[PDB]
Amino acid sequence: SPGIWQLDCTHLEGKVILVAVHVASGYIEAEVIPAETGQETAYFLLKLAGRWPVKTVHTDNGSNFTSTTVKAACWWAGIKQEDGIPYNPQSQGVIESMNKELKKIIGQVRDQAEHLKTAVQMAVFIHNHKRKGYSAGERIVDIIATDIQ
Amino acid sequence: SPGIWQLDCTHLEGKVILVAVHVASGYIEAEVIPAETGQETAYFLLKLAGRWPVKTVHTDNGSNFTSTTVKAACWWAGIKQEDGIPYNPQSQGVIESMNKELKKIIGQVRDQAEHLKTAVQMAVFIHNHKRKGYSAGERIVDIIATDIQ
Ligand SMILES: COc1ccc(CNC(=O)c2ccccc2CN(C)Cc2ccc3c(c2C(=O)O)OC[C@H](CCC(=O)O)O3)cc1
Numbered sequence: 001s002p003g004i005w006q007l008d009c010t011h012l013e014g015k016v017i018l019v020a021v022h023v024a025s026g027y028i029e030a031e032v033i034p035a036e037t038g039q040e041t042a043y044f045l046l047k048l049a050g051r052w053p054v055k056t057v058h059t060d061n062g063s064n065f066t067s068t069t070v071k072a073a074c075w076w077a078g079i080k081q082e083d084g085i086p087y088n089p090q091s092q093g094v095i096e097s098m099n100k101e102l103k104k105i106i107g108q109v110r111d112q113a114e115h116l117k118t119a120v121q122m123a124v125f126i127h128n129h130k131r132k133g134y135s136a137g138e139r140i141v142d143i144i145a146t147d148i149q
Numbered sequence: 150s151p152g153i154w155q156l157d158c159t160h161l162e163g164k165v166i167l168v169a170v171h172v173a174s175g176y177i178e179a180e181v182i183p184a185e186t187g188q189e190t191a192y193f194l195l196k197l198a199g200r201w202p203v204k205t206v207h208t209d210n211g212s213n214f215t216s217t218t219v220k221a222a223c224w225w226a227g228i229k230q231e232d233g234i235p236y237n238p239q240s241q242g243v244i245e246s247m248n249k250e251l252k253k254i255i256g257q258v259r260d261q262a263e264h265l266k267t268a269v270q271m272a273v274f275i276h277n278h279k280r281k282g283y284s285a286g287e288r289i290v291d292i293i294a295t296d297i298q
């Protein structure tokens with residue numbers, strides 16, 4: 001579970017926000033892309049896996065699971081690519097809630113930047129630093145450090 | 150110590166590679182940009198600080214130290230913006246060596262992608278996972294986790 005991430009794609013302002021959630025901590029990375037292609041998704045995962053020890057990614061949809069470019073990225077980065085079937089129905093609700101939370105934060109910062117990508121990164125910052133009391137950022141580091149040790 | 154980062158800018162293929170190094174661990178994040186403007190640098194720092202607990206950034210040059218956009222991002226993200234004067238002359242050699250290491254890795258992967266940005270992210274991955282025996286990625290997590298506890 002320290003190495004398990006879940007992809008999530010949401011929409012805003014006619015653009016796509018691609019999110020990777022670290023399941024055990026709720027920590028996230030996100031980017032704005034024009035559309036969710038296999039190439040965009042592959043590049044995003046390459047970035048993520050160079051930054052955190054990504055063992056497994058539950059893809060966000062069947063097209064990214066199928067994509068040979070995505071599978072090639074997962075091969076490259078040593079990632080086990082898996083489906084995102086919510087065998088635990090709670091997975092669904094957690095992601096849905098996270099998307100609503102993220103959109104709320106983006107609205108709260110939206111006027112502090114011209115470009116959506118800027119607001120999304122501000123939203124990533126606020127989400128990861130929010131104490132719920134540890135933050136998601138604190139949680140992911142402790143989880144992973146415990147695993148190293 | 151756990152919160153201190155150093156910016157570093159290097160060039161390849163007529164493009165700019167912007168790097169942030171976590172001083173204590175040698176862990177890096179990097180991006181390819183067309184040119185190193187205050188705005189690009191500001192956006193890069195906002196991204197970094199949403200992802201790791203960035204307390205202090207030593208800027209890579211005087212233009213980024215001066216830039217009001219960069220100062221505004223550091224204000225936004227709660228980052229202490231500092232100069233990058235190598236009061237310890239070893240700082241300067243470490244960065245030069247890091248740039249040469251990264252360019253070497255980029256050369257080793259260059260034929261595995263059309264776009265330089267892809268090769269740079271592959272280089273980030275290889276650099277952070279390389280056991281020197283712990284990796285830079287292991288070290289940053291352990292350093293920050295020790296600080297949390
Ligand atoms: C990480 O994924 C992979 C990493 C490595 C491989 C194995 N190598 C090859 O198959 C290969 C080799 C040589 C030339 C072209 C290719 C095929 N390419 C398509 C690889 C590629 C993918 C995503 C990208 C790329 C590029 C690129 O060639 O640079 O460029 C930037 C965009 C940016 C996001 C966007 O613009 O959508 O993401 C496959 C996937």
Ligand SMILES: COc1ccc(CNC(=O)c2ccccc2CN(C)Cc2ccc3c(c2C(=O)O)OC[C@H](CCC(=O)O)O3)cc1
Binds near residue numbers: 111116186192219222
């Ligand atoms: C992160 O730094 C800051 C974040 C926030 C502030 C306070 N808010 C404002 O001053 C503000 C408010 C409203 C409209 C425009 C602005 C002024 N902007 C210039 C802010 C901005 C900076 C860098 C960017 C931006 C944008 C943007 O407006 O979205 O957009 C993407 C590019 C991507 C990199 C590149 O393309 O160079 O980086 C300052 C710096």
Ligand SMILES: [Cl-]
Binds near residue numbers: 138201202
């Ligand atoms: Cl954080």
